[model samples]
Structure formats: structure tokens, C-alpha cells
Target: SFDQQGVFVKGYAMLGVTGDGQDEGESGFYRTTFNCNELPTDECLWAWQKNQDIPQLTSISWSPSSQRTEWVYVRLGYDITQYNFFLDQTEGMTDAETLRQRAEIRFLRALHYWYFLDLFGKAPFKEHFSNDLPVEKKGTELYTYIQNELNEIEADMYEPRQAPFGRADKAANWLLRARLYLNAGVYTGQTDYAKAEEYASKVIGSAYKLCTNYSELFMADNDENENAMQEIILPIRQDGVKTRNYGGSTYLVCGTRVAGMPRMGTTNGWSCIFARAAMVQKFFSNLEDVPMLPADVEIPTKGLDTDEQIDAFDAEHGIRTEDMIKAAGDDRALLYSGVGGGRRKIQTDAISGFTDGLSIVKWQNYRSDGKPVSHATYPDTDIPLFRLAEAYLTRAEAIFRQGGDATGDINELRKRANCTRKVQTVTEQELIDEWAREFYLEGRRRSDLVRFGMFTTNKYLWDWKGGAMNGTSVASYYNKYPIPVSDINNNRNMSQNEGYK
Candidate 1:
């Protein structure tokens, strides 16, 4: 059993390697960047990264072999059976280690269940990793299991203030619990708005504090500061031996050699994803316009008729050739070119040292050779899984949804973003926009939209465009991702989501 245990642990760590380690000169983190490029036209150096955009990535029908990377993280987050056994025998373990391990398991469980809930809406609950459970028992039973586990584990959880740095304490669990309750409206058709508020409040009351600068929050150097304040809950650590893959930097930076594409050594990488026009508009409409800074900012002409050749720029500094086209229409111009885009605004000039167009500057990891780097191994930045601002907004939203005025809570979050006032009172429409802005591209958008009853309603790139934009009816089952065909074939007990067939 100990040998098998060692094997499982080794396998778990190897799973992280699948996505976080380097692959034949290409980095595992590139897979995440590839998925972010909504268009699935280009071939990824690794095939698995290309498959993540569709429902198949989360499908049980998909072969576990193809999903080892995701499963490794999933297993690491929970898999209490292995942890419990190891800890029970390991002597000289501190009380803190015991508490943290337990909390970590609960946190991982919450995350794992949330993934299934977000994708399937219901799944089977298993206390032990048993293979013989009936299919029907998996879905609703899993929901109950998650709820019960969260409830019980949270009771014994330590407060964040008392816990050591970089670990999931009580407050983190509370945030996860709050997220579960907030999504109850979608999962169970029963709005547990009260429970949502309760758990959200607990998280908000903890040691978590908002960062003064929104931009700094995303910087790698700020991870320790951000984590210390509990702004980040389950952050992926980027330390001496542990590192993060720079997904945002690679995706946003063009693959131009002269432009500093990083490790790829060429500017061939494609930028498939962009801000939704609707979301771009929201940024413009929400805030009052200010004149562009003459020195710090450069506003381009509308629809440049000339084939003006703009120089390549870095991730943070880019010139927009389409700035003119984007600025043509009054409303479109206001949204894309005007001052309201805030942190999302693209520079009028080309990204000074790289390739053309708008690109995300959040995760730049420059190499000594002057090109961009990929592998998660080369970078060490924490990916914030839970944050205090999110907790505050979650509670504010829950309270507001439950007929309570949550202006104070919402204002606190707004203040962190440098907004002066509380703005409008909480409404379903407003909360959706708030979540979109606050948690953009954090892999929480799909879940956030679904719980707000807007997942099927919102306009995505291809499938639900018309229905989403027009506020028309969408396919009900789109709420849950389809189980992969492979899972259905291999596991006779497994069932596909409705309409997948």
C-alpha cells in the first residue's frame, strides 16, 4: 500500500508537470495560453491544449489519459484518502500541518466539485474513490456530498489570521462555500441567497484585504503581498522550485522575432481571442470619459486609409492599427478608443517591442535572449483562486439579491478599483457586469455567467451569438457541458448530459 501510495503521489506531481512543465522545447503553460485563444484554427504544439476549448475537456467520456494534467490538479486538491493515510503515520508533523492539510483537502474538494457543478450541474458524490457507483447516484448525490463536506469542514477550519502564509485557512473555505451557495440558483433551481450571504460574510470578515492598486494585483512580484492580505485564496505558488507558466504573456505577445515573442523565437503565434464588443462597451458606458493623456496616451485616427506600417511593441506597449477602425463609430469609438476602457484599454501605438494589435500584458516573463518564455517552470507567479475582493462582491451580491442593501460592501470593492462612489444599487444586470470586470479571464467567467442565469443567455463567439445578444431562448442543456463520448463508451454506468446525443 505504501508503494502504491508513493506511486500515486508521484503520479499526482507528474500531472502538474503535464501542464506546468516543459514539453520538447514548448512549455506546458502554453496549453493554457492556447485555450485562451478562442479560435481553434491553429494547431497547438501539444494536441491536448487545443482540445480544452470545447466541452470535451471536462467530459467524463474523454479518456483520462488525455486529461491527466487536469486530473492531477483535481487529485492534488482533494484525494483525502492518500493524504489521510500518509499523515496518520508520519511522525513529528506539526498541528499546523495537520490543520492545513485538512483545510487544503476541503478547499480542493470544493474546487473539484465546483468544476463538475460548473460543467455538469450535477455529479455523483463518493467519499472514497470507488469505481462501482451507479450513474444515477453520481449526480445529485455528489451535490449533497459537496454541501455536507463544506458544511462540516468549515466548522473546524482555522481563521485566516491564525494560519501560516500561502495556505487555505477558514476564510478561503468560506469563500468557496459562498460560491457554492451563490450558484445554487442554477444548480438546484433553489436560490440559497441567504446561505450565500452568510458564507460570503464570513469570508469578508476575515483577514483578507483589497490591494490599493488593481494593476499591481496581477504582477508576479506582488504575489506575496497579495497573498498575505488574503486577496488571493488558493493561489498557485511560483517559488524557487515551484513556478507558474506565463499564459497571458505568451497569448497576448505576437510571435514576431524583432517584436520579442519570447521563447517561440518567431512571431507566428496567433491572437484568437479578444474582448467581447459588448464587454468593451460596458467599460465605456459604466465610467465617465476623461480626455486622453497627451503624453502618456496616444489616440489613433478613425479608419486609417493609409497602410501605415506601425512598429512592433512589447506586451504592455502596443500600437493599434485597427484603432481607427475601432474608433470609427461614435459608440464603438467611445468603447474601444475613449478613456473608459480603463485597465483594458489598448494603446494607440504598436506594442513597442513586439508584434501588432491589442495584447494582454498581465503575465510577461521576458527571457535573457529578448524573446518571450513559455514553460510554467520558468516563471513563478501565483494564480489567485479566491480573493477578498471577490468575497466582498459575492456577499454584496447575495445580500442585494436577497433584498438587502449592500452598497457598503459593493463600494468597498469599487474603492479598491479607484472608483469614487458606490454607483448604482445592486441589480442582476449590474452584478453580472461587475463580475465580468472583476474576474475577467480568470477562468471563472463561464461559472459566473451560469449562476447569474446568463451563461446560456450571453453572446459567445459562435454558438449562442444571436440568442445571447438578443436575449432569446437558448438550448437548456447548454447549461451543462456534454459528457465526452469516450466516457460513455468506456463506462457503461456513465450517462451523457441531455442533448449531447
Candidate 2:
């Protein structure tokens, strides 16, 4: 009754936090980027990430610790405590609108506990707000709470496309359920691939279609796309004029800008984000750091009779194509690295020197038409919270569970990429590779890596995983980051994850 609405898909907007990097002391861009970057072990990443943060979480990390922060512990850990605060207030608002809002809050709580369970191995359960903290529950108990909670409210929840732009609806519940079902074995020691595929199919078969271009989907006006049923299942709306914040795309846009990045009207960049060379290497092979040639030496190939024009120019003037990575030949390799005393490609790195890495356009703030973004600084790009592309990948992996043909599901994505005809069949590893290829810099890397058994183990290696030169494996305990020491120290009911004190 007091607060208009207490929860939101947009973290700060309806949560009443108004953080805007005011008090949270972290950028969701930097925070989410940090977690994902940790998993993939991006080379040229620098001295801090060298120790893997795997060592940081369990060893002696303080407040800023991804492994020890209150966001993971005091806040997310005591989430049921916070949810109870909402449920009690809604008991009196019986009008249709308030009742509808109340149902949303129920879905919201289910979502909160789902994230709590995913990040912390499990979440606590409570029926009401109280002076005393509730005892924490683990495994199937918390998992079932998330599962049944969403399932029970499905009929009352808004059917897909019925709710306004930025609200939780039946599709959100189904998306969360599909994600939970995909990880059924990880949380509850049971694989529910059929259930995962079914829910994913429900969302996929809904009124959604893949966007024509991947790059355009991240642009500023993506929400206003020609198709209302375009890829994004949900977007936390941001407008530079009305809702300004250094969260979401604000952090993503400013943070990813380095020296040579194309300015979408912004002059300078924050330069806090980068991608692993190993991950980028998956798109192409035989990379080298050729010195950048000045304008006179560089020839611009206009799209006019492109290949033949270049060939004719080369034959006429004896120009050479020796140092090129053939960058323009692929649609999926949307990477850009600086050249003025900087890298042509990030080929030389084990640790340190982030300027020595590649940047992606998947998180930009400009429009697809190259118009200036709404505000010079704060981003107007609607960050995709969940989109339909994930459903194809989820369905493919679920099919991988039953030894079925994953090619059809994967090519569903590759077909969009315009590279569908080359390989018709897919292995599980190829399916995993396609995930990295499509979903890079979207904050799903760590969860994807963990789902594939490569997070804690050295089965796969990047630059400095586990602080090793060639990426050595570490203990499996780092798989789930530890509960923050602050909560565990104060709350009698709080306990650390396995292999932690």
C-alpha cells in the first residue's frame, strides 16, 4: 500500500533502490561482466583476474568480493525475509488492479527465490516477515518451492504478450521454469530434459520470431523494432531522459568503450569490459598482431563490386592483403580492437593489459541506422533480460540429453547468422560453441560454462584460469561462490557452501 510497486524486472526502477551506482557499489554491467569474465578467463584481462577470483572467493576476500559480497549473502540470502515484507502489505488491497499487482508480486518472489537458489546453491523459506531469521533450506526443498510456486500461479498470471512492456507475465514464469528445468540435475540430481524442452518450446512457439540481424537487436531503438514479436522476451526499459542510470546498458556502453571504438556520438569511453582471445579465437584461426597502417597505406573497399574492385585495385596498384584476418568475411565475428599503439587483435596475453583485447558491438547504445543515441551519455538501449534466441539453444541442449539431432535446433540460430549450410550435424561441444558464439557479452557465460562442466574443472582452459599460465583446474567448490562472511558471521541460520567454513 505504501510503495506503488516494490519489485521490477528493471532492478532499480521499481525496487525503490534508485541506486544508479549510488549505493550498490557495483555496476550490474561490471558485476555481471565480472562473473562471466571470471568463468571464461579472458586473456589480456589483467593482474586482478589472474588469480581466477576462484582463489579470491574462498580465500581472504572482503566486501567487494563476488564470492563474499552482501548482494549474494545479506541481501539475496535473506530474500525470503524481504518477500514476506511484500506479501503482508498486499493482504488488504482487494481491488482488481491491486489483485493483479499482487499476483505479479507472487511471481516476483518466485523469481527472486529462483535466482537465490541458483546463485547460492539454495534459498531459505519463510511464510511471514519476522524479528527472527528463518532456517535456510537446501537442494530439492528450495527447488520445489520455485517450481510449484510458479506452476500454481500460471492460470492467474498474464498470458504471453498480454502484460505491458516491463512486467512479469506467464512467459517470464515459463522462462524461469525452463532455466530451472535445464539445471534440474545440477540442483536436485535429476535431469528433466523433456520438461526443459517442453517449456522452452512453449515460449519459442509463442508469438516470437528471431530478429533479422543480431547487431540490431542490441541497438538503442531495439524495443521499437518493426516486429512487436521480435526476439526479446523481456526488456528492462531505459530512457536517457526519463530513466537515467549507470546500470544496464549505461554501464555496458560506457564501460566497453576503448580508444578506437566507434563513437555513437559519445566522445570518450569508460573501457571496463573486454572479451577473451580464446573465445574470440573460436570464430577464426591464425591470428596475428599486425601493426596498424596509416590512411594512405590503408585502402577503403567500397561495397561497389567489392571483391572484383579490390582485386582490380590490387592488380593496378600492386596493393597487398597480407596482414588481414579477413575480418569482413563473417557475420558472427562482430569484434573491434584499436590500432594506434594498440592491438590489431588480442594475440599476445596471459594476464594484464586489457587494452590488448577485443571489444564487441553487442552492447552498444547507437541505433541500427547509426543515429546518435537518445542522450550523449546515459544509454537508451533496452537491455534484453530474456530473449527468444535462448530457447533454441536450450532446446538443442535438452535434445543433447536424449541423444537426438541437435542440428535442427542449432541451425535455427545459425540460419539467422546466415551460415547454416556448412555443417548439418552438431556435437554437444559444437552446441556449446554455438552458445558462446551467439550469446557473447550477454552475461550468460558463467552459467553456460557451469552447465557444461567447464567452470571449476580444467577440461577447458583460457588464459589465467585458476591462476595458471595455461589455465589449470581448481577445486570444484568454486563452482558455487560462497555465502558472504558478513551474513554467516551474524545470522545463526546461515551456513557456507561446501568446502567453505
Q: Could you tell me the lDDT of residue 313 within candidate 2?
A: 44
- Measured against the true structure, the TM-scores of the candidates, in listed sequence, are 0.67, 0.83
Best by TM-score: 2
RMSD of 1: 8.8
TM accuracy, model 1: 0.67
TM-score of 2: 0.83
lDDT of 2 at 171: 80
- Residue 494 displacement (Å), model 2: 1.3
lDDT of 1 by residue, 1-501 (tens): 445335334322322233343322133332332332221111111112243423333221233233433432233323434444444444344575455555455556555566666565554344444354424334455666778777777755666756555556778778877887887777766778798888888777766777675544544454555433447765544431343333323332221112222232223444333333344434444322322223455534333222232222211233232232223222112112222112233321211221221233334233322333344334433455567778777888888887888888877766666553356667776777677556654556656656665544434332213223222335656666555455556557667678656
Look at candidate 2 and tell me the lDDT of residue 188. 91
Question: For model 2, what is the alpha-carbon lDDT of residue 62?
Answer: 23
Among these predicted structures, which one has the highest lDDT? 2
Clashes of 2: 1
